[PDB]
Amino acid sequence: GSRVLIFSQMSRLLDILEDYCVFRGYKYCRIDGSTAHEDRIAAIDEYNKPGSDKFIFLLTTRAGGLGINLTTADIVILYDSDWNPQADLQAMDRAHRIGQ
Amino acid sequence: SLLPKKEINVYIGMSEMQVKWYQKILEKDIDAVNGAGGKRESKTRLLNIVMQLRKCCNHPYLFEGAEPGPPYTTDEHLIYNAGKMVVLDKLLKRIQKQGSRVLIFSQMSRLLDILEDYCVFRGYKYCRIDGSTAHEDRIAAIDEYNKPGSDKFIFLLTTRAGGLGINLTTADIVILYDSDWNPQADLQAMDRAHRIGQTKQVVVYRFVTDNAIEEKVLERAAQKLRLDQLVIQQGRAQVAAAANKDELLSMIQHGAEKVFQTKGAFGTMAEKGSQLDDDDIDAILQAGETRTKELNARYEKLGIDDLQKFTSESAYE
Amino acid sequence: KSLLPKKEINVYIGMSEMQVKWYQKILEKDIDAVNGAESKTRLLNIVMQLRKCCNHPYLFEGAEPGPPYTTDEHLIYNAGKMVVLDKLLKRIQKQGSRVLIFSQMSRLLDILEDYCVFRGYKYCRIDGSTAHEDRIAAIDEYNKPGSDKFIFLLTTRAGGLGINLTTADIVILYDSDWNPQADLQAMDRAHRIGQTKQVVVYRFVTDNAIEEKVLERAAQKLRLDQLVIQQGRAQVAAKAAANKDELLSMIQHGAEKVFQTKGAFGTMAEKGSQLDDDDIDAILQAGETRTKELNARYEKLGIDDLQKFTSESAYEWNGEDFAA
């Protein structure tokens, strides 16, 4: 019953995970960080909607910005790591913050 | 692994004798007690009342002519005439029974004098650092209590006496007979036994005269302690309020790929083309205010731990 | 009196086909620094050129169609912000509202001057190169009851202290200052004591370009300034000594119960002078309980909820005069 955020340095790796989530029939949203502000607002709220359909959320590590909330997920997977330890540390803090 | 210390407020009452002296102190200057006189009065008058109530919450024998009439003996009245002594007597007894040793701190040296007579009365081996104690003396006092297989049991100190960095990890219990006005002072006295080298769980007991002046004293210090934490935790804010290479690099690279992709006009211009009817403007303003709310409600809620840029971020690679 | 809070709306704007060409040209002429390779002085130039492009291509020389330089509709449709502004001003006038227009670049106000003349918009202007007697002539000519003027062009760092243009209700920040406190001064030329109507502030932001990223970094420093404010309040209260009233509340606490007490007080009354281990276990149990409850009350007071004596905020004007 857990919900997961998955972070990556490479947007073309998330392209691979997109085809994976379709191959396994997983519901998901995605923020490249090279998306749009309104588009990623929708991706956030749809994942946090009380009663959300989605299960996985595809993210790039430095994408969302500061202080977005994805506490409706409880597990974070860092597919690969940033050079700066804070970028990964802030990726965990999407889930590990006030409201979790 | 150093275990976090256990700090417990032990709320104590007053003996019948203390109530008599507590009433007299309040009575001898009842005008200032009820808040009478001018607002121009210097702080000296009220502060004198605070001192007397503080001494009275410690031990009545700090007032001359209090101890039962001449000749003077050192017996059980030294214990049962002060509520803190009664709680301390069974507390110290239980501390030695479990193989624990204790540091006892106080603000007043005349109270440690009272505790000296208590320790001799009960046959407790003890050491004392006063703040009126020479350097070579307290060195030997530290070593005596820290000697392996030490004879001593209680260590009597004033909250300020020793100085920074002295080590008393051969004790695991700390008893604050009375509290200090600045919380860092009491916190430093706990860290005489709660520091690297301490193996056992440090427990700190703080004697507090419930429903009197010392309970109200304690709330203020707890506030000033909470204030200090907010300052220290926010100490990173002013150094953050220039521009990193990456910060300047992110400003330029932001949306630059989408610009190179574009051959005609950008968003608002490509979709509508430099001509805007009322409906198109209305969407622009509704979309902006919505993005404005979500942006402000996201950042005005943040804390220092999210805004603080690590120094390793400058290590651009 | 009642001063309605200011409504600040970010208006995200695209770029014209001409802007895209120059924006690409700027990125291309120094693609080496854009890629990642060390001096920020090289980057600070790229930033300033991109800001000019987000504002107007005609700020670059040779951009406007060659001589003669004629003022027509091309002054508008070649800049994304101008297209939005022309229709925004058109609606502003229809609803009987007057607008102050600020900018970081005086050469942009020059572009807006040519626009106002081309559209028949009566205007005034304070450039920070404007004499005091010439400033006061523009202030009064704009504020006089039944005034003919409609637009007032000012530089964000014009540096007028205490200038009053409350006869306008709309403020448009054509581009944004790197210090959010400077823009808040420009807002508080209409949104100040004396304003009777709803102040609406439009902040033009070039979407999906450098101006959108600057917008986010401004909110970060804007919040950090609030945190410094709160650290200052918590710092002042922490070093503050007790008042005569604060000392009084400490002395008076429980004084009535002591006068009420004839025998012993509290613990010494509950089980006098000799305490078994069951007595100590009850004191320590309730004592550790009251300690946790006491800490919980104070562990919930954060910087964002501090007793404010002076009511400053990073989201209102500093009173600081920004004459650069």
Add this chain to the structure above:
Amino acid sequence: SLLPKKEINVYIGMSEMQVKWYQKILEKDIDAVNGAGGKRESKTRLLNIVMQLRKCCNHPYLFEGAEPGPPYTTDEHLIYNAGKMVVLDKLLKRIQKQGSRVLIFSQMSRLLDILEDYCVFRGYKYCRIDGSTAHEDRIAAIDEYNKPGSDKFIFLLTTRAGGLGINLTTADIVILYDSDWNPQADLQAMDRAHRIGQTKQVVVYRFVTDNAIEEKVLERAAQKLRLDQLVIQQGRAQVAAKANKDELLSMIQHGAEKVFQTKGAFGTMADDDDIDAILQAGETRTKELNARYEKLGIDDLQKFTSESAYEWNGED
């Protein structure tokens, strides 16, 4: 058109003679003034002290042996030994000048005896009804004051006989020397001038001894008046607590249109996630409903009587 009345408190000091007697009252039972008696104590002991301070705030001559020693003569010290009488003299002097007629009420019949001797000293024509006055007598006193071309100018009355349903609109100024514990009794005296038939503006002047017992008394009556108003305006809240023909129709009709249109299932029927959406949105609608109604008053919740008179359908 009946003009609303102006109510003005006149805060009055006391004379030195009043001060000495105000002290003597508190001195003669300073143990009770300090409140050192038992709770078995009947209200009488403290009520006696209250009455004296009321007598003192009115006029010192109400005490035995207070007025200067024999002989008892009507002089200026009848006016300047009482704080209220000093202000009353100039107020009566100015009211008489502007062609207005005044009703003067009081609690104590022995004070009307003092105003009895005062109006003789000043040459004011007057009437008086004590509440110890006969019926046919107080008809002649009412008519004499209300007869066209009346000689009288002042009307002395106790608050007892004021509230009987009588009519004194021929005067236009009401002076309350002292106030009753029951505020609705003074309002019975104000409504002697301020009622049907009054042609001029009715102004009520209330004499209050500032910084004394009468100032605190004024607050107690001001509370009881506000309490009286709250209970009157919320009175119909109980009959409203005890269904219409229009409510039953709206109850039945609420969703009937949306129901008839349905061809499958209804709103939510047409996952554990599916329950978290309902509970969250249901809590939101609950907040707005409770906030909207729990802030309302009887002006809204009260059903008018004509609301039960279903007549036709505004929207078929």
Add this chain to the structure above:
Amino acid sequence: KSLLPKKEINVYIGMSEMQVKWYQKILEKDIDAVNGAGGKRESKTRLLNIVMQLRKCCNHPYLFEGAEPGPPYTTDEHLIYNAGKMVVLDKLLKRIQKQGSRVLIFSQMSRLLDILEDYCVFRGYKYCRIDGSTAHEDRIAAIDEYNKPGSDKFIFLLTTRAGGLGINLTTADIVILYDSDWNPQADLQAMDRAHRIGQTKQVVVYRFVTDNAIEEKVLERAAQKLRLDQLVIQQGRAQVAAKAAANKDELLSMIQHGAEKVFQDDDDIDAILQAGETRTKELNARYEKLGI
């Protein structure tokens, strides 16, 4: 001890396809009163029946005879998916039990508790029941069975009638009002079976409401009845203060006022009326801002 204020949440529910058919059938078989043709006196009685039949429909179609497929009647999944409230209840109970909470379920209709009884056995929920039936049904025995330490029970089915009898059910923390009583004080008296002295957890009250149907309009009329009842209480309290005579403390504070200070021109005479009227308007302002 700390008794947490109760969280009351309206759970808005739709209707199944079967309910819509019956809800329409009720409205259709009696359209003259619904359209307003009822008249003066006869009409009011006809409308009161339609209300009660719609409430039966909002509860469960099987309350109407001939609704459930003919004899025999077996308890399967059709007992749940044919009623909107049952679907929400089935998953809500699934969450309530999983988080270790025990739930009281109230209802206006005992024949609906009959349906809920068939549901609990169909799902394996241990339960007790009080119908307000005083015929050989000792309600004391079920209370003790539900409160016993380490109890086997999970659900307690009650009629809103039998709830307000001074019975104590503090071992449960969740109350679900399947349907609501017309008198709000009856439901509040039903909530206090769990939310009373003895409760240790946060009491949450779920009120099932059929959205966009008669139950939603009833919900608003209940908010009216609940709020003005508070006003009558406030009037009663305000009534005592107006009838109350002064206490010994009230008399002493009146006497002591200014006692210590005593022991210690027409332009101007007009100033009293200015200074007095200022204080007179000021005095009234303090009390006009009180209100109930």
